[PDB]
Design a protein around this ligand. Structure first.
Ligand SMILES: [Fe+3]
Ligand SMILES: [Fe+3]
Ligand SMILES: [Fe+3]
Ligand SMILES: [Fe+3]
Ligand SMILES: [Fe+3]
Ligand SMILES: [Fe+3]
Ligand SMILES: [Fe+3]
Ligand SMILES: [Fe+3]
Lengths: 169, 169, 169, 169
């Protein structure tokens, strides 16, 4: 039993290892999205920058879980991170819709991880998830939904072009 | 009779209490408008900010009347402020049209209040209304009418999107 | 079902709409208190400023709930905000005592809303209430209780006058 | 007929000469009040400074009427300014009460002067009175009434001493 370990169950420890893989997978997806909009036949630089920043955020999510795992005395066990499920992401609207579905899947996985901590009485782990992950997911899911509405509002062509300029930095 | 009271008729005092309620009602309407454009399925942040500022202006209108009531020796009597007459405000054009109708109703109520002061010989109250309310209403009604014209000019979709960016801060 | 909606129950959504009305009602009460101490026959400017700041805080409470409602995918439904239950608030001590009773009623309503979120498994909503509302209520209820003790200590007349100068900014 | 004279009736011109005398009389009263509280057997330096500032304000009122008289083409005719009706002004409360009665007498005289301008169709003179005199009188009468309430609240002795320190600069 590691020196720091206290009120930290193996099932909680295993759940954190699974979430690390998912955050790394989300990071991979956004990286793929970013460079897809960097293609010469797509060429939307706001979308490119937007998904690069989102990719880096997900990397921070994974590493903060790695750091937390060590803090509690758990042991990180890494797995293959799968390639994303598409090679091309359609229009800006399509990519944004994919991004919402991704964020909602990470959110449910986080809520499932909270439940493991709750049933195990991991009072600290629950507040860690609440403060550092659950709040951010809710903000991100709202922002992305707004983006979806506006990409539908502006339409294709010039509309998508201007959204790239005015809604993304 | 309160210490400051001089040339201040009960009918003028009652009129100010009625106007306080209306300014508070306008404030409530704009608050509702602001957060309606903050819905994920509306998501126009310029409209949201625009109506939040207008809501706060109306709150200032109500409180300045409360302050004036005390200055003259009157007594503030508050009433229920009704919920606004809609829960959803349509398009940006629809909301702007509603906002013009609201401002013109407050304006007529102010002009009716001026008439109470005029017939009662309340020379100071008349100039207070003129300087601090009538001028602002005329400016606001012109600004809103311009906004209506431009929302008709740009049309729905991308047009409404760009008005949100270029005409509202 | 709105785009962001996830782990957000209609009963939680309805509870937030009820709390919005209560925060708006508290805001109305403090506004009434503020201008009551601005009467020429009351004329305590520290109490006036103190309750104006408290009124604005309650307005922020209501609007942050409106913002949160939209974040989760709920729909804001506004209701009449009732006039406060008094037109005059007595002495500084009386007003402070009323203010404590008000804050404790909002607190219980918040704790009742936490229970709705808890039973529904709304992990994020619970931490939102904890971080942004429950902590502030506990601070405010302590501050007000201290004020009550000191208004009893100083007594009426000069004592109430000096409390207005030394305990309120 | 003087070069500037236009829409300026002799009755309006005579009314301004009467008001000049009254403003000068108010200035004299406040001067007497100021130095009364400077007596070694009164010795309240906040009251002394407070009435000195009020005296200087009244002097400005008289001179602005003198300036306005010349602007319209009227001719200033000065009269004896009577000594104030008391030589000693009692307590701080007594002096404040006298000061309220004085300000309300000047106010009624101003409202009577507005009526002369109104019946004569002196549109400019009416707004001059409104902007530069009527607003200030209403502010001053409210401030003084507040002071009366607080001098009653604190009582004699230490209370009057502390009002001199905390309510007057
Ligand atoms: Fe993440
Ligand atoms: Fe994310
Ligand atoms: Fe208004
Ligand atoms: Fe307005
Ligand atoms: Fe609150
Ligand atoms: Fe509060
Ligand atoms: Fe004067
Ligand atoms: Fe004066």
């Amino acid at each position: 039993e590691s020196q720091p370990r206290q009120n930290f169950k193996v099932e909680t420890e295993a759940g954190i290892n699974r979430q690390i893989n998912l955050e790394l997978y989300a990071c991979y997806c956004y990286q793929s999205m970013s460079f897809y909009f960097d293609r010469d036949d797509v060429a939307l630089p706001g979308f490119t920058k937007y998904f690069k920043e989102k990719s880096d955020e997900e990397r921070e999510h994974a590493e903060k879980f790695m750091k937390y795992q060590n803090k509690r005395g758990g042991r990180i066990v890494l797995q293959d991170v799968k390639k994303p499920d598409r090679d091309e992401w359609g229009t800006g609207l399509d990519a944004m819709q994919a991004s919402l579905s991704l964020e909602k899947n990470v959110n449910q996985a986080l809520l499932d991880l909270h439940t493991v901590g709750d049933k195990e009485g991991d009072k600290q782990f629950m507040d860690f998830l609440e403060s550092d992950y659950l709040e951010e997911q809710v903000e991100d899911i709202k922002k992305i939904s707004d983006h979806i509405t506006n990409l539908k509002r502006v339409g294709s062509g010039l509309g998508e072009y201007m959204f790239d300029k005015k809604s993304l930095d």
